Structure 1
Amino acid sequence: YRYTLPVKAGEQRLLGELTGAACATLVAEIAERHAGPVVLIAPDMQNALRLHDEISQFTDQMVMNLADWETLPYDSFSPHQDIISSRLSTLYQLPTMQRGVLIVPVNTLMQRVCPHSFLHGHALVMKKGQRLSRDALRTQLDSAGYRHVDQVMEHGEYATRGALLDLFPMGSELPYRLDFFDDEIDSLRVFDVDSQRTLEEVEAINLLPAHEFPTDKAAIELFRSQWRDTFEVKRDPEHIYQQVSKGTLPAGIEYWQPLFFSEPLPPLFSYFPANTLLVNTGDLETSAERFQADTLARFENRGVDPMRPLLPPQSLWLRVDELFSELKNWPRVQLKTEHLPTKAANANLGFQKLPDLAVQAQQKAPLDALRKFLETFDGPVVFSVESEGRREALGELLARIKIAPQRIMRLDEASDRGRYLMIGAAEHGFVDTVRNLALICESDLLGERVGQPVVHLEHGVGRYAGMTTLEAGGITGEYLMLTYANDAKLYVPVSSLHLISRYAGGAEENAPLHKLGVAAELLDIYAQRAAKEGFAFKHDREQYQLFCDSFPFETTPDQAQAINAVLSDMCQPLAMDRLVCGDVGFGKTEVAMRAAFLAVDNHKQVAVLVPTTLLAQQHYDNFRDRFANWPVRIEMISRFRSAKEQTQILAEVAEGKIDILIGTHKLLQSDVKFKDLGLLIVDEEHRFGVRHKERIKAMRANVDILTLTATPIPRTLNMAMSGMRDLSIIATPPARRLAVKTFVREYDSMVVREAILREILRGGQVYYLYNDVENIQKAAERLAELVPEARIAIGHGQMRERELERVMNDFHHQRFNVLVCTTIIETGIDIPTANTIIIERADHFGLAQLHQLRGRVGRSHHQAYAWLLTPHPKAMTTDAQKRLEAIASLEDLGAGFALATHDLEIRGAGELLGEEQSGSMETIGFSLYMELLENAVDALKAGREVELRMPSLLPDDFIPDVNTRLSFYKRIASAKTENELEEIKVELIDRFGLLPDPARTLLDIARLRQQAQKLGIRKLEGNEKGGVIEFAEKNHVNPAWLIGLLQKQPQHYRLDGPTRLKFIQDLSERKTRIEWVRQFMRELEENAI
């Protein structure tokens, strides 16, 4: 094609011009026409994973990585032998492979592996008619290195029961049972780890050794001999000599691998088949050198502690000279993104970078660049979307420019004038000018980043109050007198004028003055919701089965049980009030998604409420992905959405066309009116408070409230445990969640650097919580210097939305590892790749907050740490010590509920009938609460703007019971005549006596609104400083008289807009404001036309 392939001893083939996301397609092309393996030598482990997700998009060849030890050179952690099973297995198939791509970083390629005589000397194939005794096979496995257990579940274990020998080989991912008979294998049956029953029978099966070093007694004797040969022995039962002599293995024993063989570990280049074709990326002379330097530095730093000494780095890792001498034994194709000028063994491939394509809502036409680019491109263009739901997010996005991309499976299918789309992890696009093809990825539509007050510094802020003469012991001196708070006079000598500075806050008339030197509403809501019957959802079996099939996991028995309880409760006439309190990351969201699917199948406009914008966006993405194959409309509302589209969303929701609306506190602002609400889902309830939780409940009395959380606030936890609300605990798998490690250390730069470098070398991402927007810029800048290897961004909710959104989006796409963040990431942002969180100052954080932050790491098969940096402990407050010792005391999966029940009964449950969820508060007992609720329910069953910034209500001391209060509210608000308002007033006086000031203000506000409704003033406002009259489209104000008022008092009447009239009045008193407004409106209506 465009270039030949290198087939010789060590010849090179340098290809240039390959832009981003071009090396992947080039590797895919090479692997499809080379009759042999391709070993892709990535320059960095991170990059390797990237290619593993890109090449697999463009080809069908077996693209697989080489599982490296997840630890660090000379670390103190085992490789978690499961990974070892993924490593030996490859090493067994690697000498004999004919087609496929094997991806190795420089870190793993520079490592040395076992001699392969341990591979095909400890590894077996067992057929049906094997004349091998029971004990012979048992000792065979024991010498191989298997562990004798009785409940074999994982890799490298076997169990025996008489004639039933069941072993889990490291060749396959499933165990097998032999069912011996007469010292012969009768059956070779695979049995499940969960059901313990046979699925089928395999004629021949392969098994691999437990570890990468021999473990039998002869191996231990050889290890001891090599140890006494190389190092020196110390009599101490933790020294890794007398610790391996006993029989157990130290933590990081894998770096003492050469001691078990008595033969040098080959460079792994012997493992490649005869004809491989190494494909490079970036450069190796730099990455290999950096890895060698880091390994040598860590060997010198850790070549101490004579107990557990370290081997030379040349006995475990190839020298860079050895690596680059051994790379000359294979042909190589070097993919680099630069213009290679001209020569043989050198080619250029037109892969220009994509033109300026971006989307922005600022202009009238957002897709201007796209619409103009797709018109003037003669060749094909293929969009690349990472997810299936994302495809829709890009399919209706291109519908505005009248283009429907036909989907293709391989890039070769692109016709000449074709707009196509494909799914894969491609990040950036290109313009292959050679065939005039174009690839446009999802990130190529975003672009780049887008009486005078006086201050005296000694004391504070006072009010200048003139000059005075004062005697001071026979000396009369002149002073300037300042009146601080509480009329405390301070006399500054006129000579000392320089400490008297002018106020700088721009609030000369709003400056401070330093000192020198709910039960009813909640009861009624509970009674109303417990009085009537909620919607009885209708459940479809097979149609919901498809939605279940859409889930790419298996619900763990506890998550499935919570799901069943939720659906069973929704399918009842009673209103569902439930809690889903399970530990973080255990699939809590999916239960809510299933409940939402059940509700929306009956057209009930599920409403999701999350206490942060990032949760809103993440749940929007997740819900859109899951519901990417149903006729359900999902929309997000928050401050991120513009003011022009938020109104559109509200109109759509009120119309009844958006069936899922995910929103922050905006959902409770009284302007979010649902057409037909039947399901609410409050996620992370412990960051809302009682008011926000029942605000929506009051409007839709019988809505079914689903409540998800990990650490409930004590009030709602006691409420659930006492039976007021149903409870569902999810403390179980997801399978490969791993026991987030907790370390409570005093702050240290070396600790932070070590943790960040450990995470970076793993390829993950680090959370670095600072939680102070003022100094977060300085903190991130300082961390950038502390760890130059890391890429650092800043993320918090106090910067502009278009910036925070893009920064968080970039963090998803691995554009940087460390993200110095505030507590905005405490609410449940998933980001599976992030598995190390560093809290700079954790002393001042609640147990719930600390556990939630610790729950952000992990979320996957990886081992995740959680460092909680603290100041010097004596400086910490006692409660900080208690909370830190409690949080570090509980490091287990499912511990989020024990911690919640500790935070309750340490802080105590709050007022059950009121606010203040956390605290003793001397709350009323549950027996009393149920009695009052039943009493209110029974009493209710046999039943059934001119705002002036002043209280206008019926106080509790006026009308104790709630139902009477609500009835009179309805009667006053619905009264359409002053006569009926007077009747209500007389009824109030008859039944309760004197009218409090709030009651009289409410009644006269009702009267004023009644007058204004007839007149035409839609919104008459007032504050202490004045007010605004907002007339209607067709008001009844006499124009000539209005102009007369304007020209007689310009200062008190100013038209600012078509219908907004600002009046400025020093309305200090509520009564005076009421009467001034009364007379203003009266003189208005007398002239009404």
Structure 2
Amino acid sequence: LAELHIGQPVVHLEHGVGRYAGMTTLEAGGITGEYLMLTYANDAKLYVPVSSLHLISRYAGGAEENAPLHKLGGDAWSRARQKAAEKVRDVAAELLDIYAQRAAKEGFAFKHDREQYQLFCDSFPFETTPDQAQAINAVLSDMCQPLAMDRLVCGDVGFGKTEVAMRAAFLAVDNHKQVAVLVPTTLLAQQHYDNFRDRFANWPVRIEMISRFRSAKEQTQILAEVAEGKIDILIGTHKLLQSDVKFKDLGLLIVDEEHRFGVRHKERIKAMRANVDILTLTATPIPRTLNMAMSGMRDLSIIATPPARRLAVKTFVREYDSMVVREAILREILRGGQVYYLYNDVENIQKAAERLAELVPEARIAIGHGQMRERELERVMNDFHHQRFNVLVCTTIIETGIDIPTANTIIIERADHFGLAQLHQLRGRVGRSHHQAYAWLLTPHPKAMTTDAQKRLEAIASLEDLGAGFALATHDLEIRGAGELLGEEQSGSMETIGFSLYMELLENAVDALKAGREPSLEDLTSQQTEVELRMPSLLPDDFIPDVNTRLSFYKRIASAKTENELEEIKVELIDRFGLLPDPARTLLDIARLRQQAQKLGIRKLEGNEKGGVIEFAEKNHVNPAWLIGLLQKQPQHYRLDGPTRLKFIQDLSERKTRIEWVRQFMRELEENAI
């Protein structure tokens, strides 16, 4: 299910976006051809030929609730196309320097160790899940190839995502490439530092942090060691973006939780080291980054099959209720775990903890927010990590990926102003073990709730199942939209043309940087070969009822490049389907003809009842001497049409006769070819 849902938004570059409205045939001059219905604003029906199928793509903006039905002739699509092309100008120094070094430079190849890697495999004190082991294989094999590696490890939370990272880091330190990992938080930075120092407790590998918990002199010492490269694994927050980290040899960058970074930052780290093997980790991406994830400019990987006993956390879309807080805190405390209490208001977090401390007398409560002393907050996480207090009156600073498997109940007192992926990440704060996790989300009155968290709560409640990390991601795309494909503002539609259009603008920029073709050489329209013999050639609707199969087979016709493809297409059609129609076999042979012309030059052909015109190519194989021999032996049938065209006068009455003449005609071409 990735194409051809009816009523789904669907894009055509000339006119904008519409909704799919079926497939039919129409008689338009004796050729009752097949055309697709597209609906626009004011019910504008557009019928599209099957040959022009490639002018139709899935809408990449999501926007399933509301998408712009461009009224026909409204020119807004043209204006947005020109605006995007202005943004897609190859003078753009944001990525054309990357494409210049793509046209001028290369990358590093990691070498694999078949023996020492087994020792660190035995240093892994668990069993890898099947869905994570293949992720390890995909990560490590892509390390062992020479291009600048770029992979996403978007899996479910607590599934050992750190394990894939430490395996990749172990291969990288087996080549000593000064691994630079990057999380957007000092708290989980310190947590992962503890993970690194505990797991890598045997090897001569230097694992250090540069962050705020290292002082202005300690972090200075650590960055000096980075400049001398004696640190093998560096752990840091956005401190790394301050133009001050300089590895003597940087080979592996490991981004974790890219959803909070901002593409300005993700390219700030990227523009330093060219041949770095970039690694990207998250539980959920940005919908813009999710779109470029599924469209496959970079790699994709989903993790499932939970490690031991991970569970469906009970989503509680409940009102702000003190007795609900009572029952949740008591049931969690009798279970033995700790409680989260999200507040997200520093100006009232002291008062909220002060009232809640006497509101639950049996709780142990402290305060956590990111506007007090960082060592005091370090003391707070020291207490909560070591189970020193159960209920935590906190801001949304707990959404920083903190592990704490003992916690199994989270209470969000106000679910108003929080995104849905953030809600899922907060749902990932409880569980991670065998004990049951509850997820209490206290809300204000549903009228005084919001305009959007009604949707967010019905999404977070209806989605509680195994594998919901990408389902909520496919909700996040088309509730907040994919932003600008290069610039900022990744949430919002941002005039979403489509990542498929990034292919064509990038290749036109490649033409521009080819130094002989301009940006004015923008090959927007490239049919690149065209033939016509004037028959109705279709997949018949009574023959093929499913429009989905029909369009797919049309795509097979389009993607056909050899005759054996045609052979297998025809035999699968006879296999699964039986009869071999006249227009179907014709268009099969027409695709064969286009295969011939691509094999044999031919820019353009036209044919009719009396003949037609051939348009040759330069780097061709057309026999000139044989051709003028053909001319001087049948002047009745042929005349020149320019130096590169040819009008042929042929008694093309019977459709079979047309078929034979063109078939044997290009056979004649193929014999004496030059």
Q: TM-score, normalised by structure 2?
A: 0.62
Q: 1:862 to 1:492 in 2, by over 3 A?
A: closer
1:747/1:869 contact within 8 Å kept = yes
1:1056/1:1062 contact within 8 Å kept = yes
1:520/1:962 contact within 8 Å kept = no
**1:1034 Cα offset (Å):** 69
Q: Aligned partners of 1:666 and 1:947: how far apart in 2?
A: 62
Q: Aligned partners of 2:30 and 2:228: how far apart in 1?
A: 84
Q: 1:1055 to 1:958 in 2, by over 3 A?
A: same
Q: Secondary structure at the match of 2:217?
A: helix
**1:1079 Cα offset (Å):** 85
Q: Which residue of 1 aligns with 2:621?
A: 1036
Q: Aligned partners of 2:648 and 2:222: how far apart in 1?
A: 35
**1:1074 Cα offset (Å):** 78
2:59/2:498 contact within 8 Å kept = no
Give per-residue Cα distances to partners, 1:203-223, cap 9 Å, x unaligned: xxxxxxxxxxxxxxxxxxxxx
**1:553 Cα offset (Å):** 0.9
2:613/2:641 contact within 8 Å kept = no
Q: Which residue of 2 aligns with 1:956?
A: 541
Q: Aligned partners of 1:1078 and 1:639: how far apart in 2?
A: 75
Q: Aligned partners of 1:668 and 1:676: how far apart in 2?
A: 17
Q: Aligned partners of 2:339 and 2:641: how far apart in 1?
A: 52
2:6/2:20 contact within 8 Å kept = no
Q: 1:783 to 1:721 in 2, by over 3 A?
A: same
Q: 1:653 to 1:1012 in 2, by over 3 A?
A: farther
Q: Aligned partners of 1:520 and 1:961: how far apart in 2?
A: 47
**1:1063 Cα offset (Å):** 87
Q: 1:526 to 1:996 in 2, by over 3 A?
A: farther
2:410/2:439 contact within 8 Å kept = yes
- Structure 1 range deviating more: 507-516 or 1056-1065: 1056-1065
Q: 1:996 to 1:692 in 2, by over 3 A?
A: farther
Q: RMSD of the alignment, in Å?
A: 21.5
1:753/1:787 contact within 8 Å kept = yes
Give per-residue Cα distances to partners, 1:992-1043, cap 9 Å, x unaligned: 9999999999999999999999999999999999999999999999999999
Give per-residue Cα distances to partners, 1:184-227, cap 9 Å, x unaligned: xxxxxxxxxxxxxxxxxxxxxxxxxxxxxxxxxxxxxxxxxxxx
1:579/1:708 contact within 8 Å kept = yes
Give per-residue Cα distances to partners, 1:39-68, cap 9 Å, x unaligned: xxxxxxxxxxxxxxxxxxxxxxxxxxxxxx
Name stretches of at least 5 consecutive residues in structure 1 with no aligned partner: 1-445
Q: 1:746 to 1:701 in 2, by over 3 A?
A: same
Give per-residue Cα distances to partners, 1:643-672, cap 9 Å, x unaligned: 111111110000011111110000010011
Q: Which residue of 2 aligns with 1:222?
A: none
**1:473 Cα offset (Å):** 85
**1:734 Cα offset (Å):** 1.2
Q: 1:957 to 1:631 in 2, by over 3 A?
A: farther
Q: 1:781 to 1:954 in 2, by over 3 A?
A: farther
**1:923 Cα offset (Å):** 3.3
Name stretches of at least 5 consecutive residues in structure 2 with no aligned partner: 73-90, 518-529
Q: 1:1006 to 1:514 in 2, by over 3 A?
A: closer
- Structure 1 range deviating more: 820-829 or 920-929: 920-929
2:6/2:22 contact within 8 Å kept = no
Q: 1:1082 to 1:882 in 2, by over 3 A?
A: same
Q: 1:1062 to 1:897 in 2, by over 3 A?
A: same
1:837/1:857 contact within 8 Å kept = yes
**1:797 Cα offset (Å):** 1.7
**1:533 Cα offset (Å):** 2.4
1:527/1:934 contact within 8 Å kept = no
Give per-residue Cα distances to partners, 1:587-608, cap 9 Å, x unaligned: 1121111111111110001111
Q: 1:852 to 1:524 in 2, by over 3 A?
A: same
Q: Aligned partners of 1:496 and 1:928: how far apart in 2?
A: 16
Q: 1:753 to 1:575 in 2, by over 3 A?
A: same
Q: 1:1022 to 1:796 in 2, by over 3 A?
A: farther
Q: Which residue of 1 aligns with 2:425?
A: 852
1:911/1:924 contact within 8 Å kept = no
Q: Secondary structure at the match of 1:537?
A: coil
Q: 1:675 to 1:643 in 2, by over 3 A?
A: same
**1:980 Cα offset (Å):** 61
Q: Which residue of 1 aligns with 2:651?
A: 1066
Give per-residue Cα distances to partners, 1:952-972, cap 9 Å, x unaligned: 999999999999999999999
- Structure 1 range deviating more: 937-946 or 869-878: 937-946
**1:735 Cα offset (Å):** 2.1
Q: 1:969 to 1:913 in 2, by over 3 A?
A: farther
Q: 1:587 to 1:501 in 2, by over 3 A?
A: closer
Q: 1:892 to 1:725 in 2, by over 3 A?
A: same
2:61/2:497 contact within 8 Å kept = no
Q: 1:990 to 1:722 in 2, by over 3 A?
A: closer
Q: TM-score, normalised by structure 1?
A: 0.39
Rg: which structure is higher? Answer: 1
Give per-residue Cα distances to partners, 1:85-107, cap 9 Å, x unaligned: xxxxxxxxxxxxxxxxxxxxxxx
**1:699 Cα offset (Å):** 1.2
1:481/1:492 contact within 8 Å kept = yes
**1:894 Cα offset (Å):** 2.0
Q: Aligned partners of 1:569 and 1:458: how far apart in 2?
A: 39
**1:779 Cα offset (Å):** 0.6
1:1031/1:1060 contact within 8 Å kept = yes
Q: 1:671 to 1:952 in 2, by over 3 A?
A: farther
Q: 1:720 to 1:1061 in 2, by over 3 A?
A: closer
Q: 1:941 to 1:895 in 2, by over 3 A?
A: same
Q: 1:578 to 1:475 in 2, by over 3 A?
A: closer
Q: Aligned partners of 1:961 and 1:995: how far apart in 2?
A: 17
Q: Aligned partners of 1:745 and 1:1032: how far apart in 2?
A: 71
Q: Secondary structure at the match of 1:631?
A: coil
**1:640 Cα offset (Å):** 1.7
Give per-residue Cα distances to partners, 1:661-706, cap 9 Å, x unaligned: 1100000100111111110111110001110001111110121111
Q: 1:914 to 1:640 in 2, by over 3 A?
A: same
**1:930 Cα offset (Å):** 2.1
1:521/1:962 contact within 8 Å kept = no
Alignment partner of 2:26 out of 457, 470, 475: 470
The answer on 1:457 being equivalent to 2:457 is no
2:64/2:478 contact within 8 Å kept = no
Give per-residue Cα distances to partners, 1:718-752, cap 9 Å, x unaligned: 00111111100002211200111111110111110
Q: Which residue of 1 aligns with 2:630?
A: 1045
- Structure 1 range deviating more: 933-942 or 619-628: 933-942
**1:585 Cα offset (Å):** 1.6
Q: Secondary structure at the match of 2:614?
A: strand
**1:532 Cα offset (Å):** 3.0
1:531/1:941 contact within 8 Å kept = no
Q: Secondary structure at the match of 1:834?
A: coil
Q: Aligned partners of 1:498 and 1:723: how far apart in 2?
A: 19
Q: 1:969 to 1:494 in 2, by over 3 A?
A: closer
2:61/2:478 contact within 8 Å kept = no
Q: 1:725 to 1:1034 in 2, by over 3 A?
A: closer
Give per-residue Cα distances to partners, 1:559-588, cap 9 Å, x unaligned: 001110000111001111111111212111
Give per-residue Cα distances to partners, 1:609-641, cap 9 Å, x unaligned: 101110111111111111111111011111121
Q: 1:768 to 1:939 in 2, by over 3 A?
A: same
Q: Aligned partners of 1:1061 and 1:790: how far apart in 2?
A: 92
Q: Secondary structure at the match of 1:744?
A: strand
**1:916 Cα offset (Å):** 1.5
**Identity across the alignment (%):** 100
Q: Secondary structure at the match of 2:67?
A: coil
Q: Aligned partners of 1:673 and 1:502: how far apart in 2?
A: 43
**1:843 Cα offset (Å):** 2.0
2:61/2:496 contact within 8 Å kept = no
Q: Secondary structure at the match of 1:878?
A: coil
Give per-residue Cα distances to partners, 1:507-542, cap 9 Å, x unaligned: 9999999999x9541343355357532211001011
**1:841 Cα offset (Å):** 0.3
**1:489 Cα offset (Å):** 58
Which of structure 1's runs of 4+ aligned residues deviate more than 6 A?
A: 446-516, 941-1089
Give per-residue Cα distances to partners, 1:124-169, cap 9 Å, x unaligned: xxxxxxxxxxxxxxxxxxxxxxxxxxxxxxxxxxxxxxxxxxxxxx
Q: Aligned partners of 1:906 and 1:599: how far apart in 2?
A: 39
2:31/2:535 contact within 8 Å kept = no
**1:928 Cα offset (Å):** 3.5
1:684/1:827 contact within 8 Å kept = no
